[PDB]
Amino acid sequence: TMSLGAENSVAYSNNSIAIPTNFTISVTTEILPVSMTKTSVDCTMYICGDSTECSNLLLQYGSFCTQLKRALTGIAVEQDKNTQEVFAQVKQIYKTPPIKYFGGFNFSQILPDPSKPSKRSPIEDLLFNKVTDLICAQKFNGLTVLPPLLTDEMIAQYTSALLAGTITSGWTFGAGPALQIPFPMQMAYRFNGIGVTQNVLYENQKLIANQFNSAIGKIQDSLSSTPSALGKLQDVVNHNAQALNTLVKQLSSKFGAISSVLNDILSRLDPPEAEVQIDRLITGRLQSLQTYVTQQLIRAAEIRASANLAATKMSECVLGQSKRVDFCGKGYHLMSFPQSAPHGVVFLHVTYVPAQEKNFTTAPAICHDGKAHFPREGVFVSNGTHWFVTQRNFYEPQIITTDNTFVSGNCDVVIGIVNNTVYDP
Amino acid sequence: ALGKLQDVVNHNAQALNTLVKQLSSKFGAISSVLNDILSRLDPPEAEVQIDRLITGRLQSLQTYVTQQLIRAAEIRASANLAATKMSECVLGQSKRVDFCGKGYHLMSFPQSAPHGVVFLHVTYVPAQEKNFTTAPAICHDGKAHFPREGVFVSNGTHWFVTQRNFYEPQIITTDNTFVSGNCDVVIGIVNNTVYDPLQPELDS
Amino acid sequence: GTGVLTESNKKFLPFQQFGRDIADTTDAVRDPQTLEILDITPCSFGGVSVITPGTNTSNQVAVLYQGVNCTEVNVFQTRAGCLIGAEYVNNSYECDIPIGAGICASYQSIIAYTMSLGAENSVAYSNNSIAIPTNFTISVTTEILPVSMTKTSVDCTMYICGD
Ligand SMILES: *[C@@H]1O[C@H](CO)[C@@H](O[C@@H]2O[C@H](CO)[C@@H](O)[C@H](O)[C@H]2NC(C)=O)[C@H](O)[C@H]1NC(C)=O
Ligand SMILES: *[C@@H]1O[C@H](CO)[C@@H](O[C@@H]2O[C@H](CO)[C@@H](O)[C@H](O)[C@H]2NC(C)=O)[C@H](O)[C@H]1NC(C)=O
Ligand SMILES: *[C@@H]1O[C@H](CO)[C@@H](O[C@@H]2O[C@H](CO)[C@@H](O)[C@H](O)[C@H]2NC(C)=O)[C@H](O)[C@H]1NC(C)=O
Ligand SMILES: *[C@@H]1O[C@H](CO)[C@@H](O[C@@H]2O[C@H](CO)[C@@H](O)[C@H](O)[C@H]2NC(C)=O)[C@H](O)[C@H]1NC(C)=O
Ligand SMILES: *[C@@H]1O[C@H](CO)[C@@H](O[C@@H]2O[C@H](CO)[C@@H](O)[C@H](O)[C@H]2NC(C)=O)[C@H](O)[C@H]1NC(C)=O
Ligand SMILES: *[C@@H]1O[C@H](CO)[C@@H](O[C@@H]2O[C@H](CO)[C@@H](O)[C@H](O)[C@H]2NC(C)=O)[C@H](O)[C@H]1NC(C)=O
Ligand SMILES: *[C@@H]1O[C@H](CO)[C@@H](O[C@@H]2O[C@H](CO)[C@@H](O)[C@H](O)[C@H]2NC(C)=O)[C@H](O)[C@H]1NC(C)=O
Ligand SMILES: *[C@@H]1O[C@H](CO)[C@@H](O[C@@H]2O[C@H](CO)[C@@H](O)[C@H](O)[C@H]2NC(C)=O)[C@H](O)[C@H]1NC(C)=O
Ligand SMILES: *[C@@H]1O[C@H](CO)[C@@H](O[C@@H]2O[C@H](CO)[C@@H](O)[C@H](O)[C@H]2NC(C)=O)[C@H](O)[C@H]1NC(C)=O
Ligand SMILES: *[C@@H]1O[C@H](CO)[C@@H](O)[C@H](O)[C@H]1NC(C)=O
Ligand SMILES: *[C@@H]1O[C@H](CO)[C@@H](O)[C@H](O)[C@H]1NC(C)=O
Ligand SMILES: *[C@@H]1O[C@H](CO)[C@@H](O)[C@H](O)[C@H]1NC(C)=O
DSSP: OOOOOOOOOOOOOTTEEEEEEEEEEEEEEEEEEOOOOEEEEOHHHHHHTTOHHHHHHHGGGOTHHHHHHHHHHHHHHHHHHHHHHHHOOOSEEEEOOSSOOSSSOOOTTTSOOSSSTTOOOHHHHHHHHHOOOHHHHHHHTTEEEEOOSSOHHHHHHHHHHHHHHHHHSTTTGGGSSOOOOOHHHHHHHHHHHTTOOHHHHHHTHHHHHHHHHHHHHHHHHHHHHOTTTTHHHHHHHHHHHHHHHHHHHGGGOOSSSSOSOHHHHHHHSOHHHHHHHHHHHHHHHHHHHHHHHHHHHHHHHHHHHHHHHHHHHIIIIISSOOOSTBTTBSSEEEEEEEEEETTEEEEEEEEEEEEEEEEEEEESOEEETTEEEEESSSEEEESSSOEEEEOTTSOOOBOOBSSSEEEOSOSSSSTTOEEOOOBOO | OOHHHHHHHHHHHHHHHHHHHGGGOOTTSSOSOHHHHHHHSOHHHHHHHHHHHHHHHHHHHHHHHHHHHHHHHHHHHHHHHHHHHIIIIISSOOOSTBTTBSSEEEEEEEEEETTEEEEEEEEEEEEEEEEEEEESOEEETTEEEEESSSEEEESSSOEEEEOTTSOOOBOOBSSSEEEOSOSSSSTTOEEOOOBOTHHHHHHO | OOOEEEEOOOOOOTTOOEEEOTTSOEEEEEOSSSOOEEEEEOOOOOEEEEEOOOTTTOOOOEEEEETOOGGGOOEEEOSSEEEESOEEOSOOOOOSEEEETTEEEEEOOEEEEEOOOSEEEEOOOOTTEEEEEEEEEEEEEEEEEEOOOOOOOOOHHHHHHOO
């Protein structure tokens, strides 16, 4: 019987709080499929090939062929639209400065490599390597794979522009003109977004930079060392080729006829029964093609939903800081980096995870001079003998003064109010 | 401009037209008209011809219903998205980037359209940006000062604190800065005075 | 069948006569007069696509043979296929008519080009400089979303059989 999880009992009490005293910069990967293989089918060539009599009999069924071609054309344009929606979200191609110094933060693994001809990042190069006469057989039966409108190098260029915008300008480029800001100041703004003061980032800048660099290196090692990391994108490739193979395989099916070869049927039988045999082959092949188009449409809907989600993540996680829980990684979200992948996008979510929490005795309000004092932005904590006010997400005790507390009412209404002095500047 | 809604209308009529067009298909039978088949053949072979017509027309109708269900799923997803935009953009102000227009979202207006909704997203776009020299903190009297809500900027000789999204320089005082630590830890801290409001009061 | 018979590097065993693909399609054969192996490759086929602007504007057209090399058919070779009737221009513009593999076509005659992704902007990043907005623009933008479709009901018996 499978275990759901490790058992943890939270030490809940009416007057105790746990405050984090440290943090971990966690980078996590999110892999999203964006597009599929664009397929076009020649209905007449697939069902009948070179046989004129088969085409003449096929004409009796009407506009089935036109319907299948139209549906496939809609899917093919939809895939390009999906790629445009996910990646072509900036109209300026931003570039990084020639001096790659960002206050200790290292972005070598995600920025484009000049040495490589493909102009891809090490992570993107790893993603393309790790995602992989079949093509000839699919082509020879009247099924054609159409090239993506955006080539891999242009998609990589779009990711590079997004990375340059998010690194040099923060979230400003997503909401208008790209405004330059130093990267430590940008990270301080992101720290303020999740409710941590700027001083925590500035004082611990080298530690945060080291943690970020270590996490990025771990991400590259994790992708290189795990076969099932890129399972989703490969699955899409796996489905598409298999579908074409199955459709090709359906040409070798008798479908209740004497032979699967039209030429043998013509060369061996009179037209009254040859017409019947060709009709059986036509209905079986047409059913196979309709089945293939129907699954292609269902997969197109699923990929369109995934692409819409990927576009939403690109807008909310890469082009801004998100306050939505778990949308842009596990933890308090700081920023995200896009990486191009075959038929998809990989988001590196940089999040803030609290760590090394410590118990403190807490009170809702402080009673001083017959007045109730409440924290403006923090929480009251006690280490045993002395009372302090600290920010909720990091332990930084400060003296309780009138500057950081506000007075509302007397001490007779608040349940759990404790008596302590409030300093006056 | 209104290509998406018209496209939906274009698909629906076309689907019906295709289904109507499928009535003119022999489907491997002598004729596409059932009345002719009845008026021309005995029931043993008329049953076969009617069977061919029935299976072809039934396949056409099932195909039409299948694409109608797929399109219904797509339109349901679009309608759910439209309801989400109506709740978050019209009935409130959204902090989600690009959900309610390009730029910092202020408000949205709904307009009815045939088979659809048009959202007029009113957003705030920054413009006419100006370069300034910036610092993370101000060092005064051996203490590090950080902005409460803004950013430190310098026009070349003087330091000010301004809000991030609009240029409004103000004198750096204790009211708009907070003190955390000394000047030895912050990388890039610059030396500047921090004004005290109480100093002229007790001085005079 | 029907196909080109090219020279084959495949060494058949003496008992084998035909050859098949992974997907069970014939890819090779042994000639019964001279014991040699031939690579049966089917003749070239392509999806003829016509690239045109509006008839209100012009009647000039270009033809794209999808998947067909240009030697087997203003002739330009693209990864999508062979494009006849459009002149390649080294300038980059926005995409007007999509061709594929980064190639787009436009009317100015019909030209084919590698589409520009966007205007090139280099952000003046430095470790101590910030850009602060001094003004604003109130921008109203349109977002069009479909909500409902036409409600259709079909009488199954009347449609299939009538009276
Ligand atoms: C806060 O105090 C509580 C209680 O003193 C701690 O909870 C105990 O944790 C230990 C080991 O984790 C367990 O063996 C005890 O059974 C727990 N007691 C209760 C009542 O839950 C808690 O670990 C303290 N928090 C920190 C961060 O030290
Ligand atoms: C917070 O945790 C970090 C680690 O994530 C601590 O940094 C380590 O500090 C020890 C002792 O000074 C060093 O030996 C390690 O090399 C440091 N690790 C890294 C990655 O820099 C840090 O000291 C902790 N801070 C507090 C206040 O507990
Ligand atoms: C940023 O990270 C890269 C890679 O993580 C660092 O490049 C390494 O540099 C060391 C010492 O110079 C070499 O021994 C490694 O072989 C390099 N690895 C790679 C993959 O190039 C780089 O030094 C870091 N710092 C900067 C400023 O770029
Ligand atoms: C709670 O924290 C306060 C503040 O750090 C502690 O007060 C200081 O304790 C040190 C060590 O005994 C003394 O050298 C200082 O003179 C104390 N400062 C003041 C203003 O009294 C206090 O001891 C802590 N309490 C507990 C139980 O750890
Ligand atoms: C907090 O302080 C107040 C005032 O200093 C205390 O209220 C006094 O309590 C004593 C005995 O309980 C009475 O004799 C006084 O008349 C009370 N004064 C007022 C103004 O109410 C209160 O008891 C203190 N609470 C704690 C927990 O120490
Ligand atoms: C930076 O801004 C400050 C304040 O806006 C400027 O200081 C004032 O400049 C005007 C014009 O020269 C003088 O009339 C005032 O007397 C100055 N005020 C003070 C308090 O000195 C300053 O000149 C600006 N610096 C630059 C390089 O533009
Ligand atoms: C910022 O101010 C501090 C303190 O006034 C400066 O530190 C002094 O620097 C001088 C010359 O380097 C020394 O002679 C003093 O002993 C230093 N005093 C202290 C307390 O450190 C610092 O140099 C100033 N920084 C800038 C950039 O002007
Ligand atoms: C901020 O200063 C930088 C550099 O001092 C300006 O960037 C220059 O812009 C001009 C015109 O756009 C270019 O010709 C230069 O090549 C740029 N130089 C660099 C180093 O990028 C930038 O325009 C200034 N910002 C504003 C708003 O004027
Ligand atoms: C901010 O931009 C607005 C326009 O978007 C400026 O308003 C213009 O001001 C000029 C000169 O004062 C007038 O001739 C125009 O008629 C104004 N246009 C509008 C639409 O009102 C405004 O002056 C700018 N403000 C700053 C500080 O640069
Ligand atoms: C908290 O609970 C303890 C025991 O459960 C009790 O003695 C104490 O009065 C309670 N305090 C408040 C503020 O409820
Ligand atoms: C910023 O970089 C310049 C050179 O690029 C250097 O002279 C200066 O010391 C740096 N300042 C900080 C705060 O890193
Ligand atoms: C096949 O025919 C050719 C014709 O010249 C002859 O030379 C050869 O011996 C025959 N047999 C085989 C096994 O090739």
